[PDB]
Amino acid sequence: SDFDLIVVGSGLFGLTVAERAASQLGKKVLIVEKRSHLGGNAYSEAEPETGIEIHKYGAHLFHTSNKRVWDYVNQFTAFTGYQHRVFAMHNGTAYQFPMGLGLINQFFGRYYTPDEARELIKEQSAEIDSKDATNLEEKAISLIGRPLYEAFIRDYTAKQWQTDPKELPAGNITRLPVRYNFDNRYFNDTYEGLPVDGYAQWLSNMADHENIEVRLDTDWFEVREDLRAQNPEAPVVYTGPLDRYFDYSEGHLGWRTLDFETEVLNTGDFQGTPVMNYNDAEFPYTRIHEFRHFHPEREDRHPKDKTVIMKEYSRFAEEGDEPYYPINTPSDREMLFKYRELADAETESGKVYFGGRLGTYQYLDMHMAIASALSMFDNKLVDALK
Amino acid sequence: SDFDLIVVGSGLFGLTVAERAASQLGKKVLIVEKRSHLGGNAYSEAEPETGIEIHKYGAHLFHTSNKRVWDYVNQFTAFTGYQHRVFAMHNGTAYQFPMGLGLINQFFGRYYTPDEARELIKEQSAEIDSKDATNLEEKAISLIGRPLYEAFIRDYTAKQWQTDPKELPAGNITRLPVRYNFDNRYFNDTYEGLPVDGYAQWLSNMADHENIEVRLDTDWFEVREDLRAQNPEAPVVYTGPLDRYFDYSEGHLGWRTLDFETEVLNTGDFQGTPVMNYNDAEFPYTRIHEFRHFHPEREDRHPKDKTVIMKEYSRFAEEGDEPYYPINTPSDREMLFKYRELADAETESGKVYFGGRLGTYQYLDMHMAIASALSMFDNKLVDALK
Ligand SMILES: Cc1cc2nc3c(=O)[nH]c(=O)nc-3n(C[C@H](O)[C@H](O)[C@H](O)COP(=O)(O)OP(=O)(O)OC[C@H]3O[C@@H](n4cnc5c(N)ncnc54)[C@H](O)[C@@H]3O)c2cc1C
Ligand SMILES: Cc1cc2nc3c(=O)[nH]c(=O)nc-3n(C[C@H](O)[C@H](O)[C@H](O)COP(=O)(O)OP(=O)(O)OC[C@H]3O[C@@H](n4cnc5c(N)ncnc54)[C@H](O)[C@@H]3O)c2cc1C
Ligand SMILES: CC(=O)N[C@H]1[C@@H](OP(=O)(O)OP(=O)(O)OC[C@H]2O[C@@H](n3ccc(=O)[nH]c3=O)[C@H](O)[C@@H]2O)O[C@H](CO)[C@H](O)[C@@H]1O
Numbered sequence: 001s002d003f004d005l006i007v008v009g010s011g012l013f014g015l016t017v018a019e020r021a022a023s024q025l026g027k028k029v030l031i032v033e034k035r036s037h038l039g040g041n042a043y044s045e046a047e048p049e050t051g052i053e054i055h056k057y058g059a060h061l062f063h064t065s066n067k068r069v070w071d072y073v074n075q076f077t078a079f080t081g082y083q084h085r086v087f088a089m090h091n092g093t094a095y096q097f098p099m100g101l102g103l104i105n106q107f108f109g110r111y112y113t114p115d116e117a118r119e120l121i122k123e124q125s126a127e128i129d130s131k132d133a134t135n136l137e138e139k140a141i142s143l144i145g146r147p148l149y150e151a152f153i154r155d156y157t158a159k160q161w162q163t164d165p166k167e168l169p170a171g172n173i174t175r176l177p178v179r180y181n182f183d184n185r186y187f188n189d190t191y192e193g194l195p196v197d198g199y200a201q202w203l204s205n206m207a208d209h210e211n212i213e214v215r216l217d218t219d220w221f222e223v224r225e226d227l228r229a230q231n232p233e234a235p236v237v238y239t240g241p242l243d244r245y246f247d248y249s250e251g252h253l254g255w256r257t258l259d260f261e262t263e264v265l266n267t268g269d270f271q272g273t274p275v276m277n278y279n280d281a282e283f284p285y286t287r288i289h290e291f292r293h294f295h296p297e298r299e300d301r302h303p304k305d306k307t308v309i310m311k312e313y314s315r316f317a318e319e320g321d322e323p324y325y326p327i328n329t330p331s332d333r334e335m336l337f338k339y340r341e342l343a344d345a346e347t348e349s350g351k352v353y354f355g356g357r358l359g360t361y362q363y364l365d366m367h368m369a370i371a372s373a374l375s376m377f378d379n380k381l382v383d384a385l386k
Numbered sequence: 387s388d389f390d391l392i393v394v395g396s397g398l399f400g401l402t403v404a405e406r407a408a409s410q411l412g413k414k415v416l417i418v419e420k421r422s423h424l425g426g427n428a429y430s431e432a433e434p435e436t437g438i439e440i441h442k443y444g445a446h447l448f449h450t451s452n453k454r455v456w457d458y459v460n461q462f463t464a465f466t467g468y469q470h471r472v473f474a475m476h477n478g479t480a481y482q483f484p485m486g487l488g489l490i491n492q493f494f495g496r497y498y499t500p501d502e503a504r505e506l507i508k509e510q511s512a513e514i515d516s517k518d519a520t521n522l523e524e525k526a527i528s529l530i531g532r533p534l535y536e537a538f539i540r541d542y543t544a545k546q547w548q549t550d551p552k553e554l555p556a557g558n559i560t561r562l563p564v565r566y567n568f569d570n571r572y573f574n575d576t577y578e579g580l581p582v583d584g585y586a587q588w589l590s591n592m593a594d595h596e597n598i599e600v601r602l603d604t605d606w607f608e609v610r611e612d613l614r615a616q617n618p619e620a621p622v623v624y625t626g627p628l629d630r631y632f633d634y635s636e637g638h639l640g641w642r643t644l645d646f647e648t649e650v651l652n653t654g655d656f657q658g659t660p661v662m663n664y665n666d667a668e669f670p671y672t673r674i675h676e677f678r679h680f681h682p683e684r685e686d687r688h689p690k691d692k693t694v695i696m697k698e699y700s701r702f703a704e705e706g707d708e709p710y711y712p713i714n715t716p717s718d719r720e721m722l723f724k725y726r727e728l729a730d731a732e733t734e735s736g737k738v739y740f741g742g743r744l745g746t747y748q749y750l751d752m753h754m755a756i757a758s759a760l761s762m763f764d765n766k767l768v769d770a771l772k
């Protein structure tokens with residue numbers, strides 16, 4: 001047949017499943033993708049005026065402690081030695097971040113040793129016991145105290161969730177957000193970097209296989225009856241929206257979206273670092289990205305007098321908005337459980353598997369999407385394709 | 387013969403020359419080393435109470451942009467992804483360091499953008515033109531201004547050189563010590579790391595070759611007549627003290643030395659970072675090293691409640707002191723030039739080559755010592771050994 005497997009959507013989940021079927025099982029794979037490009041939200045592109053690599057669906061930082069995933073992705077791209085670091089703008093000062101000896105010195109006004117800082121945090125957070133916290137605000141305060149909470153957590157969180165923190169689950173904070181050293185590496189994972197030639201090249205390499213066919217600008221729901229009629233026995237891996245697949249018969253799942261305001265400025269350097277969080281309520285955006293600093297190794301390909309920045313705004317996803325993060329209200333969790341029963345039935349009657357961020361109503365980092373695809377491949381598709 | 391080449395001293399210079407003669411030319415090499423161990427000052431050892439890897443002749447950080455040197459050293463050890471970062475203690479606060487947007491924010495009290503910081507530094511340093519500077523103090527001020535100079539440069543420099551900065555060469559500062567971004571990587575080199583199994587294992591691996599013989603606890607001047615009588619045609623590579631070789635016939639070359647005060651403390655973490663500079667005059671030492679933080683990958687081999695620190699004191703080297711840094715007074719430069727003429731004559735009459743830090747009266751980083759040895763090997767010894 002012209003294909004043995006259909007994959008709907010070309011994000012990291014779809015690409016991984018398609019590439020494994022194609023290279024490990026020698027199967028013909030047809031990838032159907034609604035957008036004009038591969039890669040889903042991890043896709044990146046050159047900004048036209050400067051040539052700087054930018055993102056239109058959020059900045060993407062790759063990090064993992066999963067060696068199998070790391071070895072896998074390195075078949076398709078090399079990675080730079082980039083290490084993500086973040087700074088937090090509060091009341092006119094850029095603080096070292098996350099909370100650690102650096103921020104503590106800057107904020108409380110003098111140097112605390114590791115043991116002194118531990119004692120300071122005990123004092124500050126004495127007010128509430130975390131076992132007694134009834135919401136996010138109380139849980140946060142019970143861990144780090146009111147001054148730290150009100151300076152670095154309250155408004156940022158309120159901007160991100162569009163909700164007063166008094167009205168968020170205490171379960172949204174599960175550990176001490178404070179380091180008792182000067183380590184300001186943002187991620188804690190064994191492996192980290194950015195694709196040397198950009199995400200578009202990486203993701204394109206995954207789909208670049210003699211056994212893989214890609215059809216862009218193609219909505220699964222517009223072509224599915226025709227495609228499956230060509231080969232009825234071919235399974236489908238669907239990574240599109242779960243609720244939309246079942247015609248919203250159980251309701252609309254709720255998502256948060258993001259607005260990106262991207263500007264080219266006539267300066268070589270706007271903030272001197274890739275990411276600046278804006279922790280104060282007076283700024284509508286949660287953070288600014290300056291894309292050139294993600295690839296300092298490309299400095300003589302970058303313009304000396306221009307730079308691209310991007311401001312990030314968070315809000316509820318309405319119709320026409322890109323759905324990015326599941327809201328997960330108990331109402332959402334309910335209709336999800338109902339959709340899971342429909343999906344499971346659809347798998348056994350129609351050989352349609354559900355995966356990925358949209359297909360399962362679950363936020364997935366890139367390495368988690370890859371791990372999840374590797375697992376579906378190993379545990380389900382090898383058997384379904386013989 | 388029992389050896390084709392004699393190498394005096396087993397620092398990075400000696401080891402490199404010995405290993406190249408042994409592996410590339412297939413020559414028998416005898417290494418003579420005065421101390422009880424290999425490696426010269428780069429040698430490291432376990433502290434007995436904690437097992438933590440420490441140094442007795444200064445902390446050693448490996449960094450280079452020389453790819454040939456990098457590829458060479460990786461034949462003998464793997465390197466961690468360690469990146470050196472330093473903090474500067476001034477008036478009770480730990481500043482981000484070297485001078486950049488971080489320090490500038492902390493010190494001047496609010497966030498300066500890259501362009502604003504450039505303008506601030508122009509204002510601050512307007513007082514003196516660097517073309518008019520007559521000493522180190524003026525040259526420093528002409529570049530970064532009096533407040534920055536007096537807070538972070540004056541006392542530290544005075545402690546290191548044991549001299550008022552008004553009495554040091556304006557030529558000791560040759561570029562703007564300020565970054566207009568948030569990058570606080572201490573070194574600017576392409577390659578950087580620490581030997582995964584420590585310096586002792588690395589340096590021991592260099593000498594570990596079927597063609598290499600090592601004699602520790604052996605002073606060249608006590609054994610040389612006997613050794614050379616065994617094989618008169620064998621060249622000598624001498625990395626011992628240049629002036630001592632010629633019986634101080636032209637005077638004693640002047641060196642600075644260091645005192646190290648090493649303590650085991652009953653805490654798991656003293657300062658939360660490998661190196662803290664102490665920039666104020668009230669502290670006699672220039673910096674404190676906390677050795678465990680150089681190898682965070684060894685954390686579950688390190689004790690949870692103890693740590694080794696080391697305070698570093700600088701002073702003129704007297705007899706009995708380890709000579710570490712050439713002072714290079716014009717008086718020193720004079721007798722050096724005289725010793726160079728003696729050495730050059732000794733090379734052509736006695737086949738004794740002079741290299742390394744002590745042999746040439748020149749401070750050499752490890753990669754520069756290796757590069758210098760590789761060059762002497764390529765340009766002199768290949769010919770001298772055929
Ligand atoms: C704002 C944002 C920032 C992120 N930052 C990071 C980060 O820093 N680090 C990290 O590791 N991960 C990050 N991620 C996650 C990253 O994008 C993952 O690769 C992604 O979640 C992988 O899941 P997926 O492959 O299922 O998703 P998707 O990327 O969403 O891919 C799904 C694809 O299916 C297509 N599709 C949908 N419906 C149809 C249909 N009917 N027909 C055809 N095609 C269809 C879509 O067009 C899309 O291309 C971020 C995600 C977002 C949204
Ligand atoms: C305090 C300090 C800190 C340093 N920190 C760094 C750092 O962070 N990064 C970096 O890249 N480099 C650093 N270096 C430099 C590093 O030690 C180099 O490897 C060294 O300078 C290499 O030069 P060498 O091999 O000639 O020197 P040496 O290490 O001095 O080796 C010379 C050897 O010759 C032996 N010897 C002398 N006389 C005789 C004799 N008569 N007979 C027999 N043996 C003899 C000595 O015992 C010694 O082992 C540091 C050096 C010092 C002193
Ligand atoms: C957009 C995105 O892909 N986010 C993911 C990414 O970012 P992060 O979790 O690192 O970024 P983040 O800023 O979105 O989330 C951290 C949370 O901590 C709080 N906070 C954070 C910063 C600050 O200055 N102040 C403050 O209060 C806030 O409540 C926020 O929700 O990696 C995480 C760990 O892998 C999660 O997977 C996140 O979902």
Ligand SMILES: CC(=O)N[C@H]1[C@@H](OP(=O)(O)OP(=O)(O)OC[C@H]2O[C@@H](n3ccc(=O)[nH]c3=O)[C@H](O)[C@@H]2O)O[C@H](CO)[C@H](O)[C@@H]1O
Nearest residue numbers: 444474483538539540541542543546663664665749750751
């Ligand atoms: C001990 C040693 O091996 N030093 C070497 C190493 O350390 P560094 O040069 O990085 O360390 P350093 O502190 O010894 O020297 C920097 C100089 O800047 C000044 N200063 C520095 C720090 C500070 O807080 N305040 C201040 O005023 C001071 O005048 C000092 O002499 O690498 C350098 C670059 O490769 C040189 O090779 C040095 O010789």
Ligand code: NA
Nearest residue numbers: 125128129142
């Ligand atoms: Na508490």
Ligand code: NA
Nearest residue numbers: 511514515528
């Ligand atoms: Na000036």
